[PDB]
Design an enzyme around this catalytic site. Structure first.
Site, PDB file in Angstrom:
ATOM      1  N   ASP A  43      66.967  94.166  18.560  1.00 20.26           N
ATOM      2  CA  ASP A  43      67.980  93.281  17.951  1.00 20.26           C
ATOM      3  C   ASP A  43      69.383  93.885  18.079  1.00 20.26           C
ATOM      4  O   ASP A  43      69.765  94.744  17.280  1.00 20.26           O
ATOM      5  CB  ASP A  43      67.648  93.032  16.491  1.00 20.26           C
ATOM      6  CG  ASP A  43      68.603  92.056  15.842  1.00 20.26           C
ATOM      7  OD1 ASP A  43      69.438  91.502  16.582  1.00 20.26           O
ATOM      8  OD2 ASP A  43      68.500  91.833  14.620  1.00 20.26           O
TER       9      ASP A  43
ATOM     10  N   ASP B 158      73.791  88.722  20.378  1.00 22.61           N
ATOM     11  CA  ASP B 158      72.738  88.873  19.370  1.00 22.61           C
ATOM     12  C   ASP B 158      71.357  88.556  19.954  1.00 22.61           C
ATOM     13  O   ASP B 158      70.960  87.388  20.023  1.00 22.61           O
ATOM     14  CB  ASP B 158      73.046  87.966  18.184  1.00 22.61           C
ATOM     15  CG  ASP B 158      72.047  88.098  17.060  1.00 22.61           C
ATOM     16  OD1 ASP B 158      71.306  89.107  17.043  1.00 22.61           O
ATOM     17  OD2 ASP B 158      72.008  87.185  16.179  1.00 22.61           O
TER      18      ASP B 158
HETATM   19  C1  U64 Z   1      72.421  85.654  13.186  1.00 22.35           C
HETATM   20  C2  U64 Z   1      72.220  87.116  12.546  1.00 22.35           C
HETATM   21  C3  U64 Z   1      73.602  87.682  12.270  1.00 22.35           C
HETATM   22  C4  U64 Z   1      74.010  88.892  12.867  1.00 22.35           C
HETATM   23  C5  U64 Z   1      75.264  89.469  12.668  1.00 22.35           C
HETATM   24  C6  U64 Z   1      75.475  90.758  13.339  1.00 22.35           C
HETATM   25  C7  U64 Z   1      76.383  91.711  13.065  1.00 22.35           C
HETATM   26  F1  U64 Z   1      77.327  91.546  12.096  1.00 22.35           F
HETATM   27  C8  U64 Z   1      76.395  93.007  13.684  1.00 22.35           C
HETATM   28  C9  U64 Z   1      77.131  94.010  13.065  1.00 22.35           C
HETATM   29  C10 U64 Z   1      77.132  95.307  13.609  1.00 22.35           C
HETATM   30  C11 U64 Z   1      76.345  95.553  14.735  1.00 22.35           C
HETATM   31  C12 U64 Z   1      76.300  96.830  15.340  1.00 22.35           C
HETATM   32  N1  U64 Z   1      76.254  97.871  15.831  1.00 22.35           N
HETATM   33  C13 U64 Z   1      75.609  94.490  15.273  1.00 22.35           C
HETATM   34  N2  U64 Z   1      75.622  93.235  14.774  1.00 22.35           N
HETATM   35  C14 U64 Z   1      76.181  88.848  11.760  1.00 22.35           C
HETATM   36  C15 U64 Z   1      75.787  87.636  11.124  1.00 22.35           C
HETATM   37  C16 U64 Z   1      74.508  87.087  11.379  1.00 22.35           C
HETATM   38  F2  U64 Z   1      74.163  85.958  10.778  1.00 22.35           F
HETATM   39  N3  U64 Z   1      71.526  87.906  13.630  1.00 22.35           N
HETATM   40  C17 U64 Z   1      70.831  88.958  13.389  1.00 22.35           C
HETATM   41  N4  U64 Z   1      70.293  89.713  14.408  1.00 22.35           N
HETATM   42  S1  U64 Z   1      70.487  89.617  11.779  1.00 22.35           S
HETATM   43  C18 U64 Z   1      70.467  88.060  10.879  1.00 22.35           C
HETATM   44  C19 U64 Z   1      69.108  87.715  10.282  1.00 22.35           C
HETATM   45  O1  U64 Z   1      68.903  87.979   9.087  1.00 22.35           O
HETATM   46  N5  U64 Z   1      68.129  87.081  11.050  1.00 22.35           N
HETATM   47  C20 U64 Z   1      66.756  86.721  10.562  1.00 22.35           C
HETATM   48  C21 U64 Z   1      66.287  85.309  11.026  1.00 22.35           C
HETATM   49  O2  U64 Z   1      66.326  85.176  12.472  1.00 22.35           O
HETATM   50  C22 U64 Z   1      67.715  85.409  12.996  1.00 22.35           C
HETATM   51  C23 U64 Z   1      68.347  86.771  12.498  1.00 22.35           C
HETATM   52  C24 U64 Z   1      71.673  87.801  10.036  1.00 22.35           C
HETATM   53  C25 U64 Z   1      71.389  86.987  11.281  1.00 22.35           C
END
Ligand code: U64
Length: 380
Positions: A222, A34
């Site tokens: 991302d 991630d």
């Molecule tokens: C930690 C977090 C997170 C991500 C994820 C990622 C997935 F589930 C996922 C699914 C499918 C694909 C493809 N192709 C890729 N990834 C699954 C759960 C999850 F928590 N990371 C992110 N990039 S999005 C996220 C978020 O809202 N933020 C904003 C604040 O700063 C950090 C990221 C939900 C966060």
């Protein structure tokens, strides 16, 4: 770096993960890669969705930090206990480092039912780490504690008509994973992997917006997001243009809003009616840019688990945003992406594994002349 090629796995729409080991003796876990977060956070309790979890009681090298963290997202959340332990990546560099680990003890809408990963490797910078920027991210620890160079690269290989794959090259670049040249865009600020988009085209037609709109309030790269997310105003204009380009077939309004799928008879997806999408990125030199171009094969995503249909169904995976542009898997599956932290820049090259057809391919082209690119960045 042959040892690291093909060290990513996943399922369409569930993310790309790498195998890691934590503790002594080593406990093997699958960990989502991630670039959009900065915590190393692993399941540590028997949530029923999880194949396995970190058992701190089995690790002689676990150290408790006696500090908890509560991490809410727009939907869902996780809560955990902070500590350190020894971490290694079996199909990565031959080293072991002592890293921060958030042992997840309660969560909601975080783990995915049916997925094969049990934690998240946040590869972004300390400014966005939880609870604060004193919690050193994993990659910072890796670089500080070893001679691994301060960069990593990602080749995410998507699917078409369920198993995805790819490579995370830790400490370098593998030239077999891309064709052509890498083109670099500056990391505007080290928090997310923030970049600046300076122009957007649909089938070569400029959207002609004030370029600040493209980066309101930021634009990031991302790997932990599926879609290409665009600021609401930009999404409105982009969809209007894609609708027009593709107008030899009409689709329900809800399709463009992600509210319903569209299905075609197997093998008959009319790729050629959908336009290419180009993002011009800030270049390395004053007044110089380059452009990355993706195909409908990237932004129309197959939906396999549709029990109520027998055809080939797809979801439109460009969507509106309130958090800025998010170059998710829709973008990254077209390219080999080099996160050159040492030089504060991100490289793009055409991926040797991207999905295309006989008429069009994803592309990275430059240089172009673009003026006033600094004005494209948003400031509070
Ligand atoms: C930690 C977090 C997170 C991500 C994820 C990622 C997935 F589930 C996922 C699914 C499918 C694909 C493809 N192709 C890729 N990834 C699954 C759960 C999850 F928590 N990371 C992110 N990039 S999005 C996220 C978020 O809202 N933020 C904003 C604040 O700063 C950090 C990221 C939900 C966060």
């Amino acid at each position: 770096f042959v040892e690291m090629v093909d060290n990513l796995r996943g399922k369409s729409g569930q993310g790309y993960y790498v195998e890691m080991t934590v503790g002594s003796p080593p406990q093997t876990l699958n960990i989502l890669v991630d670039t959009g977060s900065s915590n190393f956070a692993v399941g540590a309790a028997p949530h029923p969705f999880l194949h396995r979890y970190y058992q701190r009681q089995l690790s002689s090298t676990y150290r408790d930090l006696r500090k908890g963290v509560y991490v809410p997202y727009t939907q869902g959340k996780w809560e955990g206990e902070l500590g350190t332990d020894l971490v290694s990546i079996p199909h990565g560099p031959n080293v072991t480092v002592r890293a921060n680990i958030a042992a997840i003890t309660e969560s909601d809408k975080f783990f995915i039912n049916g997925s094969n990963w049990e934690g998240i490797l946040g590869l972004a910078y300390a400014e966005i780490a939880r609870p604060d920027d004193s919690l050193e991210p994993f990659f910072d620890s890796l670089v500080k504690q070893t001679h691994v160079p301060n960069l990593f690269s990602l080749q995410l290989c998507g699917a078409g008509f369920a198993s995805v794959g790819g490579s995370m090259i830790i400490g370098g670049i593998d030239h077999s994973l891309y064709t052509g040249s890498l083109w670099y865009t500056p990391i505007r600020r080290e928090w997310y992997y923030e970049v600046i988009i300076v122009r957007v085209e649909i089938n070569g037609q400029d959207l002609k917006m004030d370029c600040k709109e493209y980066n309101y309030d930021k634009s990031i790269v991302d790997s932990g997001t599926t879609n290409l997310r665009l600021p609401k105003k930009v999404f409105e204009a982009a969809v209007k243009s894609i609708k027009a380009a593709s107008s030899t077939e009409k689709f329900p309004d809800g399709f463009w809003l992600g509210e319903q799928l569209v299905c075609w008879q197997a093998g008959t997806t009319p790729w050629n009616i959908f336009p290419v999408i180009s993002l011009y990125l800030m270049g390395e030199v004053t007044n110089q840019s380059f452009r990355i171009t993706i195909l409908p094969q990237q932004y129309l995503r197959p939906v396999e688990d549709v029990a109520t249909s027998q055809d080939d169904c797809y979801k439109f995976a460009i969507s509106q945003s309130s958090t800025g542009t998010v170059m998710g898997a829709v973008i990254m599956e077209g390219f080999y992406v080099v996160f050159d932290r040492a030089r504060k820049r991100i490289g793009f090259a055409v991926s040797a594994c991207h999905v295309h057809d006989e008429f069009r391919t994803a592309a990275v082209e430059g240089p172009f002349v673009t003026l006033d690119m600094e004005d494209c960045g948003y400031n509070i």
